[PDB]
Amino acid sequence: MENFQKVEKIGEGTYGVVYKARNKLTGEVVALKKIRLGVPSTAIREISLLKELNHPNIVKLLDVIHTENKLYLVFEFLHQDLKKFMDASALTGIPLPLIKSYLFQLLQGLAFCHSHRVLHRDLKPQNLLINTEGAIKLADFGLAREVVTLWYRAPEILLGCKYYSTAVDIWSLGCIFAEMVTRRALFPGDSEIDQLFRIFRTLGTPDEVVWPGVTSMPDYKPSFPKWARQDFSKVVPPLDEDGRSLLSQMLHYDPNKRISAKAALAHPFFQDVTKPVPHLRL
Ligand SMILES: NS(=O)(=O)c1ccc(N/N=C2\C(=O)Nc3ccc(C(=O)NCCc4c[nH]cn4)cc32)cc1
DSSP: OTTEEEEEEEEEOSSEEEEEEEETTTOOEEEEEEEOOOOOHHHHHHHHHHTTOOOTTBOOEEEEEEETTEEEEEEEOOSEEHHHHHHHTTTTOOOHHHHHHHHHHHHHHHHHHHHTTOOOOOOOGGGEEEOTTSOEEEOSOTTOOOOOOOTTOOHHHHTTOSSOOTHHHHHHHHHHHHHHHHSSOSOOOSSHHHHHHHHHHHHOOOOTTTSTTGGGSTTOOTTSOOOOOOOHHHHSTTOOHHHHHHHHHHTOSSTTTSOOHHHHHTSGGGTTOOOOOOOOOO
């Protein structure tokens, strides 16, 4: 760890603190994450697998430094997160071609991870990183295998499913897609039940018709209030019918009906996809 010079604190997650740092051996500027824990053998093997999960839309894990019961992860550095970009673009809105490019790129990243049976599990604007070239990348990946944000949590997680699928990441990305379009979080819950009830108030209380097996889920309660579903024309205006159709498939209640990342890439919404350059003030 004497090989790195800290520049500034760039964030704090559930695992630990992230610093921008300079590698005294290569001159490289990196993101250094100190994992708060010595380190379990199961974690070392899993994190070593992530070093090989390389894709242009996945923040590169450069090195795993396991020294003196402490664990450090050395990552590729990107200059801004989607959260700051969305806040900076709030008066005007992110242009639809850039939203489309970012969604397409993230679906490429998820299609890759999911093909390797790797789930993110905690997608949110804060772990989506962007650069000046128009790229967007997924950070803080297969690490799951301040108050924690519930806004992007899939309903099967909230209802107590222990063995959830790659569909949880599609749900989170659908929530982020809606937020980029409307400039407001889709489901800003501040408790697990407020999160669930916000989802139910918009998409309708799920039942055995739309989600077979839902009433047998661990945290499902027959006493849940029964709300009627709302139109997507009301939920994400002024998004066009291609975008609303894709969003509806990413937000299906039944994880088995929810669109995969691979099928989403073929959706007619991406017929005119391009790669614009964002206006980044760094
Ligand atoms: N706000 S900002 O637009 O000025 C701005 C600028 C640069 C950056 N970079 N972050 C990173 C980077 O380059 N590689 C990374 C690899 C992994 C992680 C990661 O594990 N994150 C979870 C913990 C967390 C951090 N932040 C909130 N939770 C982060 C980064 C982030 C935000």
